[PDB]
Amino acid sequence: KIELKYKNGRTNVNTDTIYPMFTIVNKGNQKVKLSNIKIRYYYTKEGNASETFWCDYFTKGSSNVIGSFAKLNNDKNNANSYLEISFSDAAGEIGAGESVELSVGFAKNDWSQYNQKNDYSYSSSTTYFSWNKVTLYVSGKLVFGKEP
Predict the structure, then answer these.
(1) Which of 33, 87, 119, 146 sits CB 3.0–4.6 Å from 91 for a disulfide?
(2) Any residues with CB less than 8 A from the CB of 43 and at least 6 apart, and which?
(3) Distance set, CA 51 to CA 3, 73, 138, 148 (Å)
């Protein structure tokens, strides 16, 4: 029973950079290996340049957080792209009743002034909350949130 909380590290809506922050909470009785957990954040991208990902903070070491980018290939206006966050073997485990905190960022490399309020996963919250428009998978299976 793995839950995900979200807050926004910088709420400006027309910037090229986006600052998703998450807490991953193990609310079950069994430990989960972090290398089995993935998180997605969904947004619209205009242009063909590759995004840039970084990790500003992670309980288990920023070097153990992996950022990848992919397309939804669905022609919808709330998102066409996602950031997928994954974790290395060296990230270890989240014990039962423990949590980890993760503060990341990415640049779309559009420089377009797009309105991020149109993004499926955008929230202006500066409090970690139970936001169901970001998703969490365990061993590839969706366990938290709603896919677009």
Answers:
(1) 87
(2) 18, 79, 81, 82, 83, 108, 116, 119, 120, 121, 122
(3) 27, 17, 25, 20
Method: X-ray
Q: Report how far residue 80's alpha carbon sits from residue 36's, in angstroms, rounded to the nearest whole number.
A: 25
Residue reference for tokens 């290395």: 88
Rounded CA gap, 129 and 132, in Å? Answer: 9
Whether domain 1-148 has CATH 3.40.50.300: the reply is no
Q: Which burial class, exposed, middle or buried, applies to 17 when counting CB atoms under 10 A from its CB (0-12, 13-18, 19+)?
A: middle
- Specified resolution (Å): 1.6
> Which residue's structure tokens are 């920023």?
62
